[PDB]
Scaffold this active site. Structure first.
Site, short mmCIF file in Angstrom:
data_model
loop_
_atom_site.label_atom_id
_atom_site.label_comp_id
_atom_site.label_asym_id
_atom_site.label_seq_id
_atom_site.Cartn_x
_atom_site.Cartn_y
_atom_site.Cartn_z
CG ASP A 1 10.54 60.53 -23.19
OD1 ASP A 1 11.33 61.34 -22.71
OD2 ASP A 1 10.52 59.33 -22.88
CE1 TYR B 1 19.31 62.23 -22.86
CE2 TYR B 1 18.53 63.40 -24.85
CZ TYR B 1 18.52 62.29 -24.00
OH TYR B 1 17.77 61.20 -24.35
#
Ligand SMILES: CC(=O)N[C@H]1[C@H]([C@H](O)[C@H](O)CO)OC(C(=O)O)=C[C@@H]1NC(=N)N
Ligand SMILES: CC(=O)N[C@H]1[C@H]([C@H](O)[C@H](O)CO)OC(C(=O)O)=C[C@@H]1NC(=N)N
Ligand SMILES: CC(=O)N[C@H]1[C@H]([C@H](O)[C@H](O)CO)OC(C(=O)O)=C[C@@H]1NC(=N)N
Ligand SMILES: CC(=O)N[C@H]1[C@H]([C@H](O)[C@H](O)CO)OC(C(=O)O)=C[C@@H]1NC(=N)N
Ligand SMILES: *[C@@H]1O[C@H](CO)[C@@H](O)[C@H](O)[C@H]1NC(C)=O
Ligand SMILES: *[C@@H]1O[C@H](CO)[C@@H](O)[C@H](O)[C@H]1NC(C)=O
Ligand SMILES: *[C@@H]1O[C@H](CO)[C@@H](O)[C@H](O)[C@H]1NC(C)=O
Ligand SMILES: *[C@@H]1O[C@H](CO)[C@@H](O)[C@H](O)[C@H]1NC(C)=O
Ligand SMILES: [Ca+2]
Ligand SMILES: [Ca+2]
Ligand SMILES: [Ca+2]
Ligand SMILES: [Ca+2]
Ligand SMILES: [Ca+2]
Ligand SMILES: [Ca+2]
Lengths: 390, 390, 390, 390
Positions: D73, D333
């Protein structure tokens, strides 16, 4: 028509922060499908609506077959290019402006002025373009590599000022400033003072009345030549920076040059172009600078600031304001520039992070940008992410 | 609407200098990731705001698999293309304007007019496009490769003039001029005088009343047909340039063509399109021309100038003003064009530098640009930097 | 704000000529460095300043790894894309507008309307976008592949008209016309007449009062369904074209269908979308059409014109007006469109030239453009230049 | 100047439909010639004229040599980038806005505001940029990965609201809202109510007085924190959505969380950012939401809606409105955004479809877009079409 641009007070802020990294060679792998241009000496200049990221290309891309010679400074192929800041400077995204192995550029509110230097070393030429039109030239006056800033020139009211210099990289190089208006040289300014060697000036407006520059002396000192240029009289005087925090590379230890402000000191031969930008406030002026973390090699890059005083007489250490590039990463030329917000100017320093594997392979650079942003202290450093073997 | 363009006086200056090199094949290596288009017959034309770099592509890129045919002139795939001057004419950067193996283009102040010729050799056709719209055509009148300039046409008050010619390459080719307004031919102008072979005219304005052209005679002489077209009466007359500096290739030694100005002389068969541009001053007119350094091959390129006089009767040598391309480098077609500065026009000559490695491999070209810029003398030459084996 | 667009009289001219070829796959070699999109069903639509070249991509480029399936008509990946006419439709140059295996688009003077069809074969969906905004849909009414034109829709005064159809490719497909204003369907028009099968209509304005379409009947005839749509009453009637020059592929020999205009004849099964565009003159109307040169395969493409009369009652042969694509070259869908000149409209026909090597390899197309230009006769044909093995 | 944007009533319609798929890695094959950027956390934000498709690049392309790290990330190379919606986010098409491993952006009617977070985990920093200028920052208040939405922020009358949060991913993360006007934070809004963990809010306007958000609790529940922020008083309150249709992943079976609305329930650790968008009508408000088809893994994506009621107290099931991504396809997402039509707003949900082949290879995503469009029921799902081995 558009208004002529002027320096404005800086936007509110008291620390710089990491802004953006343009690392084109993150896409230059032999198995990839991109064409980043091989460049060096990047700089940025902004107009009211856009910034352009400039550089001198070797007219070669990575991957490619023209790597031999990309560690040479001057040749018949080098050119001033640019892309809009935020775009990757590839073969297709870039604009080739003119033939040049030394450049500068700035926007005066209405149009862009591009400056490029080429010609033989003994008799080179300053060439000026205003928009599409080649408009003027200036001749070598000391017949030893006439050259200019490698950072943005500075325009006020339509007059754009530019440092040029000529002379030996190991001896005397007395710089001069040109006042250019709409691509034409309307005045030549001959500086007074400690003028034996000034080159690669990073300039900016201290106010509407004064331009200041932190420059490189390649032969005698590790203190930067510091230019104060009064824009109204068109006169400039140069004296060495007196701070013990010597901003050149190579340099001796901080505070080791004894004697008055003017003393040259040790480790004067060699140099690097350095970042410098102003934070103009109603009451005070901040001068932001950058220097490598290594005292001798182009590795790392740290931020420093000092508010007020006279750079020529004050020996006080500059306040350390963050590590932008760690000592594990390349830290080569750095330059100041300003982004125009709606009502104020945002001061920034850009850093050239060269990928050097020597002459046997390609030679090029990434550009990291730090800008005044909020309060507190500088929080993160920049790595280019490139593995030169891919 | 915007208004019509008129020639203006030239920007102050007294020498040309190396401006820009567009060398697309510096990125065409088999191990690179670019698609420079294979082109020939490049030229540049400028409007008030920008210049476009046009060329006649073979509709193939380097690296690629369609090199067989790229040494041909006419074929059904040739197209007129352009990029904004300074962009690399690659597959994605270019705009394809029309199918054409012969072309021209120019801006009248409001819009662009593009001219292309294609069709069978015996029955070819001029096609005119104004902006996006195809507006008119003109038929072959001598049924033997109807063709045009391969350089910018010229507009004044909305009337754009264009040389077209038709006839044997080793015989008679009597040119004609088209007067085009908003993409439609409104007049044919049939020249008077030494009319037996005029092609590939490089035209421009000598004033608001006269267009002059330096052309190619591919059959009879090494002297250039010199056209003077009166814009007010729409009449033209052609006579050979009398200068002993023969501007064509092949050519005999300067001054060896004995007898009156109109004598054809020796080594007349064959030719090259040649650069020509005007420097209009208040009481003096400068005519700048380029020719190869080799008398017989397309190698090198040198600049020449003469102020005033009548090109039709002055036998005097043109004054040599710099080596733009050395004997070592290719020097193929050359052309003139003007860039629009704010108050005056900047004269330039561009040079097609063809990469010739024989019929056995790809064929294409770089473009070198020299412009009037400052004073003194021309300082540096252009190399393309391309190794055709990569 | 911008004025709503209307059909205007056509620019002066009496023959079509070769204009431009967009052959993207001239750059798709495995050794090249480009990324042409794999497409089919291209068409062009112009607004006042620009034309866009549209197509349905398979969301795959050449060279690549997704060739299997590119000879299938409908799937979940196909999308309507476009580039500005003259640009090569590559991965990066194209815009993806919406998911679609059947499309249309047109500009109404102020904005672009994009139409795309996707969904399962038994229950597909017309989706309409106006600029950035998805604005409306229309449902399958015969639950057998609802589909539309694959050519430009037509706007007058802000009302854009579009043929849609639904039904068996081997049986009945009764088309309908939608009147769309600012992305929303404001009327559904149910045609009267010979309505058993109408699909892939190529439409255009005959005047401000009438839209006409030459369409495909995939089951019963080689005569084209011809639509006359009165724009003021919003009514349409369809009857077969009576000309002996049957424009569909496959087709019997010219003049072999005996009996009245309405007779279906032989070789009715199968079809191809055909070009049709109007030349609106003050006194007369020209209807320009195209059909393949082969009577049975999609090879070659020829131009035909007829002035005045009633396409529904006149059996007369159309006047042969040139070979645009020879029988050696692929000739698949063709469509009409109009380019806007300053004061008049330029009628054009575009031709899809598919590269077919069957299902074992990639499947895509080039687009050739012919437009009304000057007088005389059509002079040159178009080859794509692509060798499918590279 | 242009004026400030305000939420308007939504365009008429009653079902979403498949709009657009941006699948960049359809062009990332080792034998292709494209450079799609490796990205994650895509989102879309629209102004009056265009939509931008943002994402957080790993500053690497496919094919390429920097795949090690693309499943991380946070790292020093992550940057916020964008292309105009419909362009393929490739190396040359994208603009790099700032160094950021967490982002948001939105348009206030006049200019764009871009938000990025980077800095060490313990001391990260919000950076705001208005247009080209870096304007302000906000410091970490809980020293544990300060982060933001990964979806559009929302502006009304020049005030743009943004959720930021900070704290343990498996503990307390009390979010705060920033009110930003022309790139400077003018107010901090500290929420009231069920405040123990709110992150990755998907926000939008319910009217001119209220912004609502559907968020992620990564620690305690599978129910989404539901924020109602009153724009007039600048106060917010958070309570868990009471619907038995738990929108997070992982989650227990619908309706198995017994007890009052605020009960956390089972399978609370872990989460996903989820789609949410409003359909404002004169007397009814529609709340559209998306969640994965798998209860435990990021596979599939289904649409749900409920009109009116109070999300904080209504236990009723949301009404299922179509499979946008099947159980076979990745569903990571999801986010909401609105497109600006001429008189009304169009609600949409976009879906990140990550190509997950493990730590061993590259990692990145496509984006699928569904929008309210016409009436009836949702017709087709989206596949990415990417074979990760090519
Ligand atoms: C014009 C020129 O060649 N300038 C050189 C410069 C210069 O060489 C020293 O400043 C000594 O005067 O050094 C360096 C350098 O990296 O040390 C880069 C410059 N490269 C380019 N500008 N191309
Ligand atoms: C119309 C045409 O084919 N023009 C030829 C030209 C021509 O053969 C001579 O001028 C004799 O007439 O020669 C040359 C040349 O380079 O010698 C290039 C041109 N090629 C193109 N412009 N396509
Ligand atoms: C919607 C659809 O699948 N239409 C088909 C079309 C149709 O198939 C026939 O017209 C029979 O109705 O044929 C052809 C064709 O090339 O024959 C192309 C079209 N391809 C696409 N539109 N994708
Ligand atoms: C700030 C940050 O690192 N955010 C993470 C996020 C996060 O770990 C959880 O929400 C828990 O707090 O998880 C995920 C995820 O896909 O699960 C992506 C995010 N990555 C990025 N947006 N870069
Ligand atoms: C500089 O002068 C200009 C023009 O008079 C003014 O707009 C600007 O704010 C001044 N800059 C300062 C005070 O730093
Ligand atoms: C030509 O005439 C126009 C006005 O019609 C003028 O603007 C321009 O300066 C003139 N140029 C020359 C070279 O006479
Ligand atoms: C169509 O109508 C418009 C508007 O009244 C007009 O401008 C145009 O010239 C007309 N077209 C014709 C006469 O073909
Ligand atoms: C919000 O108020 C503005 C005027 O201030 C108006 O233009 C807009 O239509 C209103 N929208 C809603 C949903 O109330
Ligand atoms: Ca030094
Ligand atoms: Ca390239
Ligand atoms: Ca000759
Ligand atoms: Ca048929
Ligand atoms: Ca590509
Ligand atoms: Ca959870």
């Amino acid at each position: 028509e558009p208004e002529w641009t002027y320096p404005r007070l800086s936007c509110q802020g008291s620390t710089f922060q990491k802004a953006l990294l343009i690392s084109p060679h993150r896409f230059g792998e032999a198995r990839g499908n991109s064409a980043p241009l091989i460049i060096r000496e990047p700089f940025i200049a902004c107009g009211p609506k856009e910034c352009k990221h400039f550089a001198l290309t070797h007219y070669a891309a990575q991957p490619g077959g023209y790597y031999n010679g990309t560690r040479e400074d001057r040749n018949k192929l080098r050119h001033l290019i640019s892309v809009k800041l935020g775009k990757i400077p590839t073969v297709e995204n870039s604009i080739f402006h003119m033939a040049a192995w030394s450049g500068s550029a700035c926007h005066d509110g209405r149009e862009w002025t591009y400056i490029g230097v080429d010609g033989p070393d003994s008799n080179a030429l300053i060439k000026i373009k205003y928009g599409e039109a080649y408009t003027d030239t200036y001749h070598s006056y000391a017949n030893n590599i006439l050259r200019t800033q490698e950072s943005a020139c500075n325009c006020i009211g339509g007059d754009c000022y530019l440092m040029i210099t000529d002379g030996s990289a190991s001896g005397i190089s007395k710089c001069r400033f040109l006042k250019i208006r709409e691509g034409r040289i309307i005045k030549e300014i001959f500086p007074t003072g400690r003028v034996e060697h000034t080159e690669e000036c990073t300039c900016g407006f201290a106010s509407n009345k004064t331009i200041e520059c932190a420059c490189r002396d390649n032969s005698y000192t590790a203190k930067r030549p510091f230019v104060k240029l009064n824009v109204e009289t068109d006169t400039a005087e140069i004296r060495l920076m007196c701070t013990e925090t010597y901003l050149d590379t190579p340099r001796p230890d901080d505070g080791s040059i004894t004697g008055p402000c003017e003393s040259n000191g040790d480790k004067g031969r060699g140099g690097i172009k350095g970042g410098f930008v102003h934070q103009r406030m109603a009451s005070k002026i901040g001068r932001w600078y950058s220097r490598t973390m290594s005292k001798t090699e182009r590795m790392g890059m740290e931020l420093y600031v000092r508010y007020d005083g006279d750079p020529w007489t004050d020996s006080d250490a500059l306040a350390h304001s963050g590590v932008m590039v760690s000592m594990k990463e390349p830290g080569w030329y750095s330059f100041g520039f300003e982004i125009k917000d709606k009502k104020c100017d945002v001061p920034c320093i850009g850093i050239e992070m060269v990928h050097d594997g020597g002459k046997k392979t390609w030679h090029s650079a990434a550009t990291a940008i730090y800008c005044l942003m909020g309060s507190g202290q500088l929080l993160w450093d920049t790595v280019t992410g490139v593995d030169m073997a891919l």
